[model samples]
Target: GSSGSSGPATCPIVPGQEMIIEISKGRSGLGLSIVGGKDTPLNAIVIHEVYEEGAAARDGRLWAGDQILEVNGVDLRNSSHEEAITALRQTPQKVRLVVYRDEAHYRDEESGPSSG
Candidate 1:
């Protein structure tokens, strides 16, 4: 019972870089908020923010504007906004997420050029 093979299996489903994130929540919470839905113009659940001190922030792979495609293998591509939130809450302690990034949309929001 002392085998040293205790690592995750090698994943074979990565090609174009779909982001898969595993987050462990604590008393502070997952520290992330989401927006958008199948009924919205965006038509996808998008990460609205990631708290700096939260589990999601610990993993740089997840960021605001990233669209969540699935939560623990549950497809969210066509889920409603509230439905997506419900799914995310199902696994309160630990969660696995599939996300897609749209660089164009993420880069468009520029406040202003200010001096340091």
Candidate 2:
């Protein structure tokens, strides 16, 4: 039973903008379960899940619809699904994200689907 309440406060991630989320996984995992962004990494993809107890969730910057623009320093904007997916799961001493928070994803939860 995990409530989505980790002690760390998250940086405000506005939709349609690239935000940097720097995470530390010093001794273990980042607690991330990532997915390919749309057909290619060019379009927005769904995050699906961020484990309630994982560092990704605790870091408080990542969410269920943020689209990754880059992982570490590798650009995912033109990478294939296989390449992008592979790039995402790499766990080094620390993890960083350059992402655009899908407005549809977060806004949907907040105010329901937009008519546009």
Candidate 3:
């Protein structure tokens, strides 16, 4: 819950470093759109979109371009898209998602580059 940046995340994520997020799902679904699965160069899946008014959007813990490296503490770096989906569908209650963020993606709070 540290980030207060308003824009979307659009950068490459760190390979190993990750952040765990706890999110709740609604009866409808997780409310997310994704791309770049194991088949793609991304290796791990990435969050492409977070639909407004959905569980994911409501949670407000996720952002676009977030590379999902793990699911429920289980590493998904080498996992397939289908496998990742299985992991996600298997659990929805207090789900834990692991995402890696490149330092570049979090540089939006400089407030004018420390100008004195």
Candidate 4:
């Protein structure tokens, strides 16, 4: 996870903030699900979205539609969706994520190979 020296920052969905949910086929051509709320699933946190022409999208390693499935070494499948969200909310801004891609979910092919 990326760390900022600047004191702890409040998550966007931690109340009194705006949030949005976006779902689509990711650049990697996988099923992508995003939830933006005061509290989201931990797996949804620190997800990599298509940052314009950034490396993730340019390298075809990530897209806008992929849903995260893990963080660090933690698998979200074992954790409550809400708990995963809370973990993400409390995590640093630049955290790593493990996402799940559903090749048939979106019926598209924009992303690269899976990490595992």
Candidate 5:
């Protein structure tokens, strides 16, 4: 779906350093929320929130604005929100995520709408 704001077409909208995050699922789940996909202009899977009580938050690797490019080595950059969700959920208790984070604009974009 197209948004109101139009910008010059560009490559790699989510520019940042790629990093890996390994989260061990717990009784409370992964301890994180996700957003994005083919549904919005972003067209990329991003970490929406990291629960303070979740495994990810305890590991301290993942963050709210981190863009998930791959889940367990499966590419998710071009995946829709649903596809990405399935990819992450299908993995074992130990989830290995490949992500990109922009240090230049570290806190630039926080988050948008919400869902579990």
Candidate 6:
């Protein structure tokens, strides 16, 4: 019985924004689209860290410790990450996201991973 339940859900604000709650059936993970990059370059976004058997880990497209870069093509660089998060929270269901892999972050051979 494939229903609209599998489709994206809408929030209060950002009527155009949609988000996916179930990344995979029987999973409790949520997916977010980037939509707050109007001011600056990408800095950071909260994301779930992937662990073996975790819902996000099993989803494949999303990885643990990944940061979202854009939502529906909007970058999250200039705006405060908190503001960005709020925008997503208020957005409608089923948002298309553009993310930046943490692995892409600059790293130093000696310092390890640098801040986003």
lDDT of each: 0.71, 0.67, 0.71, 0.43, 0.73, 0.46
Query: Which scores better on TM-score, 2 or 3?
Result: 3
Model 1: how far is 3 from its true place, Å?
22
Please rank every candidate by lDDT, starting with the best. Answer: 5, 1, 3, 2, 6, 4
lDDT of 3 by residue, 16-101 (tens): 56656777775666778666667777786888778886777776778876888788767778877778777777765777777877
Candidate with the greatest lDDT versus the true structure: 5
Off by over 4 Å in 5: 1-15, 26-28, 106-116
- The root-mean-square deviation over C-alpha atoms between each candidate and the true structure, in angstroms, is 6.1, 9.0, 9.4, 14.7, 12.3, 10.8
In model 4, the runs with Cα more than 4 Å from the true position are 1-65, 104-116
Score every model by TM-score.
0.70, 0.66, 0.68, 0.34, 0.69, 0.40
Estimate candidate 1's RMSD in Å: 6.1
> Residue 75 error for model 6, in Å?
2.0
Tell me how candidate 5 scores on lDDT.
0.73
Query: In candidate 2, where is summed lDDT lowest over 10 consecutive residues?
Result: 101-110
Clash count, one per candidate: 0, 0, 0, 16, 0, 25
- By TM-score, the better pick of 2 and 5 is 5
Clashing pairs in model 1, backbone N/Cα/C closer than 3 A: none
What would the per-residue lDDT of candidate 1 be over residues 10-99, giving only the tens digit for each residue?
222232456676777756566788888867887778888887888767655576767778897788888888889888778766678876
Please give the lDDT score at residue 66 for candidate 4. Answer: 48
- Which candidate wins on TM-score? 1
Candidate 6, 2-106: lDDT as tens digits:
555443322211222333232332434344333223444545554544444644344465544455655544555555756776655543333455544423335
The candidate with the higher lDDT, 5 or 6, is 5
